[PDB]
């Protein structure tokens, strides 16, 4: 099948404004949220119907308890970072863990932390070591690496446990995650440019590029972002500037889910 990924995010805020939670955790399969928890609800809840229908309440009870403890552990860790940064005010602390099951069967695994939206600690499960960006992270690195069993534990979870959860969730929502909606591609004009527009496609992974007379134009092409339409499908575009003094053979190329598409502009 296609490449799929599972990942969990954590967010902590030291001095949040009134109403906003100081801890949030959301899980994703590909681009779909599957789980959620925050310091206000103090409950872990599904974010997808095919998650709520296939996981018994004892599952949500158990992980609610874990996240109440992890919420406190995250509060402790952020207090330690902000004290050693000598930073005052409200600051953020983020964590991302997950894995990918690639098309050819190979797997990847990642775990990293961020402070104020910047890389902080990056785990290398092949050298069993942590990468530190500054001397506050270097202090955390020496403490985490002194517990060799903790590094080994994460390596096993990324390579074995994460992949097994991903396969389990892939089956629960295969009607959503493994479907293909091919895109609707058109061209039009708009000082004159050509816009290649696609919409109504899933999965959101798509490649759009312009070609002039058969050669690629990577430096001159303007790429729009892949945006959610709100109905489970996505849209994107790619423009290019037309030469007013010479005619050329411009053709839009679209790649999506193993199908290549060409639109020649006449």
């Amino acid at each position, epitope marked *: 099948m296609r490449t799929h990924s599972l990942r969990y995010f954590r967010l902590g805020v030291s001095d949040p404004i009134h109403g906003v939670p100081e801890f949030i955790s959301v899980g994703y399969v590909d681009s779909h949220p599957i789980t959620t928890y925050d310091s206000v609800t103090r409950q872990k809840e599904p974010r997808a119907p095919w998650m709520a229908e296939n996981l018994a309440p004892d599952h949500w009870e*158990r992980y609610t*308890q*874990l996240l109440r*403890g992890w919420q406190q*552990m995250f509060k402790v860790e952020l207090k330690r970072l902000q004290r050693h940064y000598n930073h005052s005010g409200s600051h953020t602390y983020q964590r991302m863990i997950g894995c990918e099951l690639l098309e050819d069967g190979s797997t990847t695994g990642f775990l990293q932390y961020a402070y104020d939206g910047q890389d902080f600690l990056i785990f290398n499960k092949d050298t069993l070591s942590w990468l530190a960006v500054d001397n506050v992270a270097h202090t955390i690195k020496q403490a985490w690496e002194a517990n060799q069993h903790e590094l*080994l534990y994460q390596k*096993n979870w990324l390579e074995e*446990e994460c992949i097994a959860w991903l396969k389990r969730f892939l089956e629960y929502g295969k009607d959503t995650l493994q479907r293909t909606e091919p895109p609707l591609v058109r061209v039009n004009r708009k000082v004159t440019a050509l816009f290649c527009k696609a919409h109504g496609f899933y999965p959101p992974e798509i490649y759009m590029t312009w070609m002039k007379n058969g050669e690629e134009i990577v430096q001159e092409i303007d790429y729009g972002d892949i945006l959610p339409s709100g109905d489970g499908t996505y849209q994107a575009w790619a423009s290019i500037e037309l030469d007013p003094q010479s005619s050329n053979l411009y053709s839009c190329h679209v790649e999506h889910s193993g199908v290549h598409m060409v639109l020649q502009v006449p």
Partner: antibody, heavy 108, light 116 residues
Framework: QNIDQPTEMTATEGAIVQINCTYQTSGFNGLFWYQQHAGEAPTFLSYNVLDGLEEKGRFSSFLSRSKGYSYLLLKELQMKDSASYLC??????????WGAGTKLIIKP | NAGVTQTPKFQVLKTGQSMTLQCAQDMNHNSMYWYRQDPGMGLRLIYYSASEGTTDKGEVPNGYNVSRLNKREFSLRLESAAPSQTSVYFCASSVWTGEGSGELFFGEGSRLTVLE
């Protein structure tokens, strides 16, 4: 969920003894060995989560994730090693499953 | 420096009597547990406290209840004692729960015998 270890084992002072532990779990997050003398509290011995053998003094512990199998190797046995040795596996939800324990008897 | 302290070390009880077992730890741990040990079985969790301010049922919660008094103390409560509850009760603590390879630190143990 299932974990098994022999009820009781007898070896001679100065010999070597290997205490086995097999587990059938959904997911695996580590295997612990604990030592419990008669009438007292269990204390932590070793931890394995990746395959191989970890040596620590007279004791060493092995893990095979594929076979769902671990053993605790006690070398140069002494009378003070007479105790129960408990096996515990952490499952996919980080819940500990405990084996019944293995009472080790040392003949002097 | 005292580790895990639980009291009482021994107790006889008549069927239907109330009882409360105490457990404290001066190690600044967050997770605390109550186990019962029986001949021929592995340890069975009764109740656990992932951190201060939350508790949840274990494998055998019926006939028991708990109270995470604070960060240090986690007491096991028998409402109406029953002969099946005759057992050795162990309280344990760990730095965190579900966080990797953290081992358990056990208390000395509490031997309960319930008689008609």
């Amino acid at each position: 969920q299932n974990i098994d270890q022999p009820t009781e084992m007898t070896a001679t002072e100065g010999a070597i003894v290997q205490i086995n532990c097999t587990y059938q779990t959904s997911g695996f997050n580590g295997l612990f060995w604990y030592q419990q003398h008669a009438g007292e509290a269990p204390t932590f011995l070793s931890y394995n989560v990746l395959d191989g053998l970890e040596e620590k003094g007279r004791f060493s512990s092995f893990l095979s994730r594929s076979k769902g199998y671990s053993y605790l190797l006690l070398k140069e046995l002494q009378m003070k090693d007479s105790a129960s040795y408990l096996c515990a596996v952490k499952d996919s939800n980080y819940q500990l499953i405990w084996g019944a324990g293995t009472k080790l008897i040392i003949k002097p | 420096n005292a580790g895990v302290t639980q009291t009482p070390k021994f107790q006889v009880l008549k069927t239907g009597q109330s009882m409360t077992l105490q457990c404290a730890q001066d190690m600044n741990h967050n997770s605390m547990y109550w186990y019962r040990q029986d001949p021929g079985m592995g340890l069975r969790l009764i109740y656990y406290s992932a951190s201060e301010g939350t508790t949840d049922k274990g494998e055998v919660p019926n006939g028991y209840n708990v109270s995470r008094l604070n960060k240090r103390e986690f007491s096991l409560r028998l409402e109406s004692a029953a002969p099946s509850q005759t057992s050795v009760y162990f309280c344990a603590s760990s730095v965190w729960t579900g966080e990797g390879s953290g081992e358990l630190f056990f208390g000395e143990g509490s031997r309960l015998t319930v008689l008609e």
